[PDB]
Amino acid sequence: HWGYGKHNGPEHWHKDFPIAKGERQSPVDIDTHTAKYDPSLKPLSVSYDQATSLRILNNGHSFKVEFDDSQDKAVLKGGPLDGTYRLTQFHFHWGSLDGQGSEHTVDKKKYAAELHLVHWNTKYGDAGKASQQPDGLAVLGIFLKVGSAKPGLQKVVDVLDSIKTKGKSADFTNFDPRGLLPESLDYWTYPGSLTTPPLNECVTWIVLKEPISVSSEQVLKFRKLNFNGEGEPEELMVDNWRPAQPLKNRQIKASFK
Ligand SMILES: NS(=O)(=O)c1c(F)c(F)c(S(=O)(=O)CCO)c(NC2CCc3ccccc32)c1F
Ligand SMILES: NS(=O)(=O)c1c(F)c(F)c(S(=O)(=O)CCO)c(N[C@H]2CCc3ccccc32)c1F
Ligand SMILES: [Zn+2]
């Protein structure tokens, strides 16, 4: 199966998913000096007040919190986007140590983790169909650094011991994703891809400039999850990040400066 290990990790994915070597793959390094300030970009609109979280699960790659996306409840618009994008799930990528774990990098700096809030363009009706379109998804990426705790993350971390191994899931209602956001919505944006198989080139990435702070104790709970199913050799779920991919013929735009 595909994974993050030596024998099935990112360097292997192109064999089953040849788009891995495509022209708009993610993540990328964000060279802040080269990013073009675009005064035509709009403020992002993040409207999460009616979000309805449903469940949390360990799928052997990450953990994911899924939302009720059957109506317009938690939506992203504005910024670089045309139309409305509905939140369907968020998940994280993180490292074995605090000096790695993010997918995007900023002037080559790696953060301890990266949160991805995945949204689909409602003009395509469902997230699967959206993932087949060049403008189908918008993923809001937020870096995590280790320092003071993020109180809004604590409900997630306290539930992780219930989903330790691949295939476990639990009820996870009333989680407010507004508690995961930094103060500023200044962002970089570029056209890219899913960072996991199938690697579809369907994502408008919106990466916030300001990281959130999480505590060491919060990230150490991420690192207690297992990639493996219960019974199988124990392999901690760490370093579940794809490294930066070639920028190729893309421009990263900044909403600021
Ligand atoms: N994710 S959660 O439901 O476990 C949850 C929290 F547990 C939590 F503590 C906070 S807080 O702002 O740190 C608490 C201040 O009262 C938030 N913060 C929220 C919800 C509403 C809102 C609006 C702006 C900024 C943050 C938040 C939260 F969504
Ligand atoms: N980093 S990222 O945001 O690119 C990203 C993931 F990192 C990730 F793990 C998942 S997954 O569903 O948990 C695993 C299979 O890709 C998805 N989900 C994908 C799979 C296909 C699809 C279709 C519509 C919306 C999301 C996804 C994902 F979009
Ligand atoms: Zn992701």
From Swiss-Prot:
> Which effect does the record note for changing residue 89 to P?
In OPTB3; in Czechoslovakia
Per UniProt, the cofactor note for this protein states: Zinc. Can also use cobalt(II) with lower efficiency, but not copper(II), nickel(II) and manganese(II).
Effect caused by changing residue 116 to E: Strongly reduced activity
Binding positions (Zn(2+)): 91, 93, 116
Its main subcellular localisation, reduced to a broad class, is: cytoplasm
Keyword Metal-binding among record annotations: yes
Which Enzyme Commission number(s) are on file for it? Answer: 4.2.1.1, 4.2.1.69
Q: How does activity depend on pH?
A: Optimum pH is 6-8.
The UniProt-reported impact of residue 59 to A is: Reduced activity
Q: What does this protein do?
A: Catalyzes the reversible hydration of carbon dioxide. Can also hydrate cyanamide to urea. Stimulates the chloride-bicarbonate exchange activity of SLC26A6. Essential for bone resorption and osteoclast differentiation. Involved in the regulation of fluid secretion into the anterior chamber of the eye. Contributes to intracellular pH regulation in the duodenal upper villous epithelium during proton-coupled peptide absorption.
| Record: disease | Osteopetrosis, autosomal recessive 3: A rare genetic disease characterized by abnormally dense bone, due to defective resorption of immature bone. Osteopetrosis occurs in two forms: a severe autosomal recessive form occurring in utero, infancy, or childhood, and a benign autosomal dominant form occurring in adolescence or adulthood. Recessive osteopetrosis commonly manifests in early infancy with macrocephaly, feeding difficulties, evolving blindness and deafness, bone marrow failure, severe anemia, and hepatosplenomegaly.
Q: What is this protein called?
A: Carbonic anhydrase 2
Q: Which organism is it from?
A: Homo sapiens (Human)
